[PDB]
Every structure is written in structure tokens, then in C-alpha cells.
């Protein structure tokens, strides 16, 4: 790929997302999704191998199907309202189809099967876009149509995502597949609170994007894609292992780290609405996430795994990766809890 072509395509991935977020017309929202899909497939196929081809195909089939249910919902809404404005839908079937369409796009369970496979099959830098930037457009739509969303449907998707995301990550050794099941679990929290306080959906989305970018950027830094290769980092860049430990503990939602803020604020908004059982269930089930985060810390930072002789050749060469924004992101991933009241800027 030509560098100028890569930049243009990357801007088209962003352009499609922006169109979804500034559109007041359902057709333009649909167009934004098609444009985003058309521009991300070439970024998945960049390294041209049978696994990238498989990932791109599975992504296209899932996204193309979801887009078709979305348009069907839009046309039903036009039939029963004679308008195209992006807002609450005017037909319960339209809401169900649009809600399922957006759940497929986000990879929420039971529509989650593509996320682990597509993420595994694409390069780390493409996985970073998939698990972060691609969440913005579908969430911005949910943010605007939540009044008509079926409560039982949305909370069922939330519960299943947390359970399946928690259980799926327990069996993984590939870092890209651990991040995929982590993503599924975290999507459940964002939608669980959406019926009650959409501002907390944004807070959870933002902090998740910061922490997920921090992990992917550090995996990219040493070009690690498995647990065992990541376990060699202590013998190359000891600092990078401390940053990984701190970020992983934050993703796990441990005080006094930043990642506890979303779980804390979501539990608050749900208990104000007399929802005790669900947030209690969600917090305990999130212990599954903390468990398979803790294993990564053990093999990365808190122990020293066997190395190889050729590792010594790497001691003589500095890190050359760009590692863009990594110093800022890691500080935001860990030390934000004292500034929690700042969440009102999202209001």
C-alpha cells in the first residue's frame, strides 16, 4: 500500500464515522456505516495472507448483514412515521431490528462470534482501530435512540456480553483474542447503563478506548502477539512491563486506578433506579475479566520467564516504534480517579 493511499483510506474510515455522528437523517447514518465498512476492509487485508483474507470476509459478511437490518428498520420507521429524523423510532419492530443491527456491529453476544476471529486475523494496528474507533459510530446511534429501545432486549445483550466475554477470555493465550473477549465484556457495561444514564455510557466508552489503545500500543511496541512472546519483555524493556501491569490492573477495575471509575459510576446510576441485583451480578461476573488479566501480569511483570540466547542481540538496539501518545495514554489509564467529577463535561 502506498503511503498516500493508506492515509486517504484511514481518513475515509474516520469520515464515515463522523458522518454517522453528525447526521440528522437516517439515510446519511446508513451511508456513514457503508463508507466506514468500505474503507476498513483494505486495512484488514493489508498484509495479504490467508488469515487476513478470512478475517476480512467474516467481517464483511457480519457488517453487511447488520447494515441490511439497519436499513430495514429505517424503512419501517419511515412507513410508520413518514420521516427520516435520527431519534426515537416509531415502531417496536423497527427498534428491535435496529437494536440487533447495532449489537452485531458492536460484536455483542450472542452476535459476538466474529470479534475474536477477526481480531486474531488482522495486524495489531488494525485490531486497534477495530476494537476502539469502530465502537464510536454504533454507540452514537444507540445514544440517540435509547428511549425506544426495548429494556429486556438491551439488558439481556448486556448480561450475555459480560458472561461470554468473561468466560471466553479464560481459555485464551493469544493477546489479540484476549483483547477481543475483553472488548465484548466491556461493551456489556456500556449498554447496561444506557437505559438509565447515557452519560455513563460515554464515560465507559471513553475510558475503555484509552486503556485499550494503551495495551495495543504496548503490544505493538515490542511486536508481541502471544502470552509467551510478551513474557520476554522483562528481559528487553523492564519499564514496559510495569506499564502493562498498571494498565492491566486498571482494565480489571481495581481502585485506585482509572478503570474503576466506569464500574463505580455505572453501579451508582443503576442503584438510583432500584437496580441492585443486576449491578451486583455484573460486578461479580467482571471478576472473570480480572482473573485472565492477572495471568498476563504474572507471566509479564510479577515473575521472570525463561528467555532465549538470541535475546541478547536485542539489548544493543533501541526501541524504534513510534509509540504515539503512549506516555499520555498510560497516565490517563491509571491516575484519573481523583478527577472523576470531571465526568460532567460529557453531560
Amino acid at each position: 500500500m502506498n503511503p498516500i493511499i493508506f492515509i486517504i483510506i484511514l481518513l475515509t474510515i474516520m469520515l464515515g464515522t463522523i458522518i454517522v455522528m453528525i447526521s440528522s437523517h437516517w439515510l446519511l447514518v446508513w451511508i456513514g456505516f457503508e463508507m466506514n465498512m468500505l474503507a476498513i476492509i483494505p486495512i484488514m487485508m493489508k498484509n495479504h495472507n490467508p488469515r487476513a483474507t478470512e478475517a476480512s470476509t467474516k467481517y464483511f459478511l457480519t457488517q453487511s448483514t447488520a447494515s441490511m437490518l439497519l436499513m430495514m428498520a429505517v424503512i419501517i420507521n419511515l412507513m410508520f412515521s413518514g420521516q427520516w429524523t435520527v431519534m426515537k423510532l416509531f415502531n417496536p419492530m423497527a427498534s428491535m431490528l435496529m437494536t440487533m443491527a447495532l449489537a452485531m456491529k458492536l460484536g455483542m453476544a450472542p452476535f459476538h462470534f466474529w470479534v475474536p476471529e477477526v481480531t486474531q486475523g488482522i495486524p495489531l494496528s488494525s485490531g486497534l482501530i477495530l476494537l476502539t474507533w469502530q465502537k464510536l459510530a454504533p454507540m452514537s446511534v444507540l445514544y440517540q435512540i435509547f428511549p425506544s429501545i426495548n429494556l429486556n432486549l438491551i439488558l439481556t445483550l448486556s448480561v450475555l456480553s459480560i458472561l461470554i466475554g468473561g468466560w471466553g477470555g479464560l481459555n485464551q493465550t493469544q493477546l489479540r483474542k484476549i483483547m477481543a473477549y475483553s472488548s465484548i465484556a466491556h461493551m456489556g457495561w456500556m449498554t447496561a447503563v444506557l437505559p438509565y444514564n447515557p452519560t455513563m455510557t460515554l464515560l465507559n466508552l471513553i475510558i475503555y478506548i484509552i486503556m485499550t489503545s494503551t495495551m495495543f500500543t504496548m503490544f505493538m511496541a515490542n511486536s508481541t502477539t502471544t502470552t509467551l512472546s510478551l513474557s520476554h519483555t522483562w528481559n528487553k524493556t523492564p519499564i514496559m512491563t510495569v506499564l502493562i501491569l498498571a494498565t492491566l490492573l486498571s482494565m480489571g477495575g481495581l481502585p485506585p486506578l482509572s478503570g474503576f471509575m466506569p464500574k463505580w459510576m455505572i453501579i451508582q446510576e443503576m442503584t438510583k433506579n432500584n437496580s441492585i441485583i443486576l449491578p451486583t451480578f455484573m460486578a461479580i461476573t467482571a471478576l472473570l475479566n480480572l482473573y485472565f488479566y492477572m495471568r498476563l501480569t504474572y507471566s509479564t511483570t510479577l515473575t521472570m520467564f525463561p528467555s532465549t540466547n538470541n535475546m541478547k542481540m536485542k539489548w544493543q538496539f533501541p526501541l524504534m516504534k513510534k509509540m504515539t501518545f503512549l506516555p499520555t495514554m498510560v497516565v490517563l489509564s491509571t491516575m484519573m480517579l481523583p478527577l472523576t467529577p470531571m465526568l460532567s463535561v460529557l453531560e
Binding site: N47, N49, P50, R51, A52, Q120, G121, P123, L170, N171, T173, Q174, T225, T226
Partner: protein, 51 residues
């Protein structure tokens, strides 16, 4: 966690590249003549075609 169902699973390639296959990319074979305007009527030109 090994199970009976995942017994046959293997770790992916280190560089994410699976070896190219040779599933049969066979050519098309065509009798070009003898009975053919351009074969002068007695030329059986057996011709392997890709497209």
C-alpha cells in the same frame, strides 16, 4: 484448558502466514482442430488454456 474437541488445534504461525495451498489450479484443455476453420482441417492442436 485442553479438551477432546480442541485436541487437534495448533498454535498459529509465528508471523501469521499459513503456507500456500495447491488445491488444483488446473488449466483448461481444448481440441483446437482438426475440424476447425483455422486448423487447416487436419491439425489437432491440443491447447492448455488459462482463460
Amino acid at each position: 484448558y485442553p479438551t477432546k474437541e480442541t485436541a487437534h488445534w495448533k498454535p498459529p504461525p509465528w508471523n501469521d502466514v499459513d503456507p500456500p495451498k495447491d488445491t488444483l489450479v488446473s488449466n483448461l484443455t481444448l481440441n483446437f482442430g482438426p475440424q476447425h476453420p483455422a486448423a487447416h482441417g487436419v491439425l489437432r492442436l491440443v491447447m492448455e488454456l488459462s482463460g
